[PDB]
PDB file of all heavy atoms in Angstrom:
ATOM      1  N   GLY L  47     133.427 161.618 102.654  1.00 51.72           N
ATOM      2  CA  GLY L  47     133.134 161.179 104.010  1.00 51.72           C
ATOM      3  C   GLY L  47     132.057 161.984 104.715  1.00 51.72           C
ATOM      4  O   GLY L  47     131.762 161.678 105.881  1.00 51.72           O
ATOM      5  N   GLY L  48     131.532 163.027 104.069  1.00 55.05           N
ATOM      6  CA  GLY L  48     130.463 163.787 104.666  1.00 55.05           C
ATOM      7  C   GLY L  48     129.072 163.164 104.384  1.00 55.05           C
ATOM      8  O   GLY L  48     128.967 162.143 103.726  1.00 55.05           O
ATOM      9  N   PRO L  49     128.040 163.804 104.891  1.00 54.74           N
ATOM     10  CA  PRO L  49     126.721 163.195 104.794  1.00 54.74           C
ATOM     11  C   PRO L  49     126.246 162.933 103.371  1.00 54.74           C
ATOM     12  O   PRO L  49     125.644 161.897 103.100  1.00 54.74           O
ATOM     13  CB  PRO L  49     125.799 164.215 105.491  1.00 54.74           C
ATOM     14  CG  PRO L  49     126.708 164.968 106.396  1.00 54.74           C
ATOM     15  CD  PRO L  49     128.016 165.049 105.702  1.00 54.74           C
ATOM     16  N   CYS L  50     126.490 163.859 102.478  1.00 56.02           N
ATOM     17  CA  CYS L  50     126.072 163.680 101.094  1.00 56.02           C
ATOM     18  C   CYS L  50     126.781 162.552 100.443  1.00 56.02           C
ATOM     19  O   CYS L  50     126.190 161.692  99.747  1.00 56.02           O
ATOM     20  CB  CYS L  50     126.241 164.991 100.353  1.00 56.02           C
ATOM     21  SG  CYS L  50     125.846 164.917  98.608  1.00 56.02           S
ATOM     22  N   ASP L  51     128.114 162.481 100.604  1.00 55.25           N
ATOM     23  CA  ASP L  51     128.863 161.351 100.106  1.00 55.25           C
ATOM     24  C   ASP L  51     128.362 160.023 100.681  1.00 55.25           C
ATOM     25  O   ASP L  51     128.121 159.071  99.934  1.00 55.25           O
ATOM     26  CB  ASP L  51     130.346 161.565 100.454  1.00 55.25           C
ATOM     27  CG  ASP L  51     131.253 160.485  99.872  1.00 55.25           C
ATOM     28  OD1 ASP L  51     130.888 159.907  98.839  1.00 55.25           O
ATOM     29  OD2 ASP L  51     132.280 160.217 100.511  1.00 55.25           O
ATOM     30  N   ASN L  52     128.181 159.966 101.985  1.00 58.29           N
ATOM     31  CA  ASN L  52     127.809 158.709 102.609  1.00 58.29           C
ATOM     32  C   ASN L  52     126.434 158.234 102.215  1.00 58.29           C
ATOM     33  O   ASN L  52     126.204 157.051 102.080  1.00 58.29           O
ATOM     34  CB  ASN L  52     127.932 158.849 104.145  1.00 58.29           C
ATOM     35  CG  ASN L  52     129.349 158.995 104.617  1.00 58.29           C
ATOM     36  OD1 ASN L  52     130.304 158.602 103.952  1.00 58.29           O
ATOM     37  ND2 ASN L  52     129.498 159.535 105.806  1.00 58.29           N
ATOM     38  N   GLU L  53     125.484 159.184 102.046  1.00 60.41           N
ATOM     39  CA  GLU L  53     124.135 158.809 101.641  1.00 60.41           C
ATOM     40  C   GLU L  53     124.125 158.263 100.214  1.00 60.41           C
ATOM     41  O   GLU L  53     123.391 157.330  99.901  1.00 60.41           O
ATOM     42  CB  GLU L  53     123.190 159.944 101.829  1.00 60.41           C
ATOM     43  CG  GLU L  53     121.731 159.653 101.586  1.00 60.41           C
ATOM     44  CD  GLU L  53     121.344 159.635 100.097  1.00 60.41           C
ATOM     45  OE1 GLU L  53     122.015 160.331  99.318  1.00 60.41           O
ATOM     46  OE2 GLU L  53     120.409 158.897  99.736  1.00 60.41           O
ATOM     47  N   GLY L  54     124.942 158.856  99.334  1.00 65.11           N
ATOM     48  CA  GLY L  54     125.318 158.237  98.089  1.00 65.11           C
ATOM     49  C   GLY L  54     124.494 158.574  96.869  1.00 65.11           C
ATOM     50  O   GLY L  54     124.846 158.145  95.771  1.00 65.11           O
ATOM     51  N   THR L  55     123.385 159.324  97.016  1.00 66.98           N
ATOM     52  CA  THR L  55     122.484 159.530  95.889  1.00 66.98           C
ATOM     53  C   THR L  55     122.904 160.692  95.030  1.00 66.98           C
ATOM     54  O   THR L  55     122.808 160.620  93.765  1.00 66.98           O
ATOM     55  CB  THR L  55     121.052 159.764  96.415  1.00 66.98           C
ATOM     56  OG1 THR L  55     120.646 158.610  97.178  1.00 66.98           O
ATOM     57  CG2 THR L  55     120.089 159.978  95.257  1.00 66.98           C
ATOM     58  N   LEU L  56     123.375 161.782  95.587  1.00 65.94           N
ATOM     59  CA  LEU L  56     123.640 162.964  94.777  1.00 65.94           C
ATOM     60  C   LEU L  56     125.043 162.859  94.174  1.00 65.94           C
ATOM     61  O   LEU L  56     125.900 162.124  94.614  1.00 65.94           O
ATOM     62  CB  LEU L  56     123.511 164.243  95.617  1.00 65.94           C
ATOM     63  CG  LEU L  56     122.171 164.449  96.274  1.00 65.94           C
ATOM     64  CD1 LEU L  56     122.095 165.832  96.948  1.00 65.94           C
ATOM     65  CD2 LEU L  56     121.030 164.318  95.286  1.00 65.94           C
ATOM     66  N   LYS L  57     125.237 163.663  93.113  1.00 64.23           N
ATOM     67  CA  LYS L  57     126.399 163.629  92.261  1.00 64.23           C
ATOM     68  C   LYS L  57     126.831 165.027  91.892  1.00 64.23           C
ATOM     69  O   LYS L  57     126.012 165.914  91.727  1.00 64.23           O
ATOM     70  CB  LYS L  57     126.199 162.749  91.024  1.00 64.23           C
ATOM     71  CG  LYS L  57     126.019 161.278  91.273  1.00 64.23           C
ATOM     72  CD  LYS L  57     127.352 160.631  91.718  1.00 64.23           C
ATOM     73  CE  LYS L  57     127.135 159.234  92.255  1.00 64.23           C
ATOM     74  NZ  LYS L  57     126.402 159.249  93.543  1.00 64.23           N
ATOM     75  N   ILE L  58     128.162 165.230  91.781  1.00 62.36           N
ATOM     76  CA  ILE L  58     128.707 166.461  91.267  1.00 62.36           C
ATOM     77  C   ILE L  58     128.049 166.754  89.917  1.00 62.36           C
ATOM     78  O   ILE L  58     127.897 165.884  89.060  1.00 62.36           O
ATOM     79  CB  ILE L  58     130.225 166.332  91.129  1.00 62.36           C
ATOM     80  CG1 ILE L  58     130.846 167.551  90.401  1.00 62.36           C
ATOM     81  CG2 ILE L  58     130.638 165.099  90.362  1.00 62.36           C
ATOM     82  CD1 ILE L  58     130.943 168.743  91.242  1.00 62.36           C
ATOM     83  N   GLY L  59     127.625 168.017  89.750  1.00 64.51           N
ATOM     84  CA  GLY L  59     126.950 168.462  88.544  1.00 64.51           C
ATOM     85  C   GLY L  59     125.451 168.508  88.642  1.00 64.51           C
ATOM     86  O   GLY L  59     124.822 169.127  87.779  1.00 64.51           O
ATOM     87  N   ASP L  60     124.871 167.878  89.643  1.00 66.32           N
ATOM     88  CA  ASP L  60     123.415 167.916  89.787  1.00 66.32           C
ATOM     89  C   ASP L  60     122.958 169.352  89.983  1.00 66.32           C
ATOM     90  O   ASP L  60     123.597 170.138  90.670  1.00 66.32           O
ATOM     91  CB  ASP L  60     122.993 167.047  90.999  1.00 66.32           C
ATOM     92  CG  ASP L  60     123.106 165.579  90.756  1.00 66.32           C
ATOM     93  OD1 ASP L  60     123.327 165.148  89.610  1.00 66.32           O
ATOM     94  OD2 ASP L  60     122.978 164.812  91.746  1.00 66.32           O
ATOM     95  N   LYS L  61     121.827 169.674  89.346  1.00 67.28           N
ATOM     96  CA  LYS L  61     121.199 170.948  89.538  1.00 67.28           C
ATOM     97  C   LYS L  61     120.167 170.866  90.644  1.00 67.28           C
ATOM     98  O   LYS L  61     119.285 170.007  90.596  1.00 67.28           O
ATOM     99  CB  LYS L  61     120.510 171.452  88.243  1.00 67.28           C
ATOM    100  CG  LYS L  61     119.859 172.798  88.405  1.00 67.28           C
ATOM    101  CD  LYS L  61     119.352 173.355  87.053  1.00 67.28           C
ATOM    102  CE  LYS L  61     118.305 172.465  86.408  1.00 67.28           C
ATOM    103  NZ  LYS L  61     117.867 173.025  85.124  1.00 67.28           N
ATOM    104  N   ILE L  62     120.298 171.705  91.667  1.00 70.00           N
ATOM    105  CA  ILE L  62     119.373 171.631  92.816  1.00 70.00           C
ATOM    106  C   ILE L  62     118.072 172.308  92.437  1.00 70.00           C
ATOM    107  O   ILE L  62     118.055 173.507  92.099  1.00 70.00           O
ATOM    108  CB  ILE L  62     119.992 172.271  94.082  1.00 70.00           C
ATOM    109  CG1 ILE L  62     121.287 171.567  94.419  1.00 70.00           C
ATOM    110  CG2 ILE L  62     119.006 172.182  95.228  1.00 70.00           C
ATOM    111  CD1 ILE L  62     122.061 172.145  95.593  1.00 70.00           C
ATOM    112  N   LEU L  63     116.980 171.552  92.511  1.00 67.47           N
ATOM    113  CA  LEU L  63     115.647 172.153  92.341  1.00 67.47           C
ATOM    114  C   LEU L  63     115.062 172.620  93.657  1.00 67.47           C
ATOM    115  O   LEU L  63     114.401 173.653  93.656  1.00 67.47           O
ATOM    116  CB  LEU L  63     114.721 171.103  91.701  1.00 67.47           C
ATOM    117  CG  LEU L  63     115.159 170.556  90.356  1.00 67.47           C
ATOM    118  CD1 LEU L  63     114.141 169.588  89.786  1.00 67.47           C
ATOM    119  CD2 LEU L  63     115.406 171.728  89.375  1.00 67.47           C
TER     120      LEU L  63
END
Side-chain angles (χ1 to χ4, degrees):
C50 176
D51 184 28
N52 291 338
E53 186 279 332
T55 300
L56 302 186
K57 290 290 168 292
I58 173 77
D60 287 349
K61 181 172 61 179
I62 301 175
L63 301 182

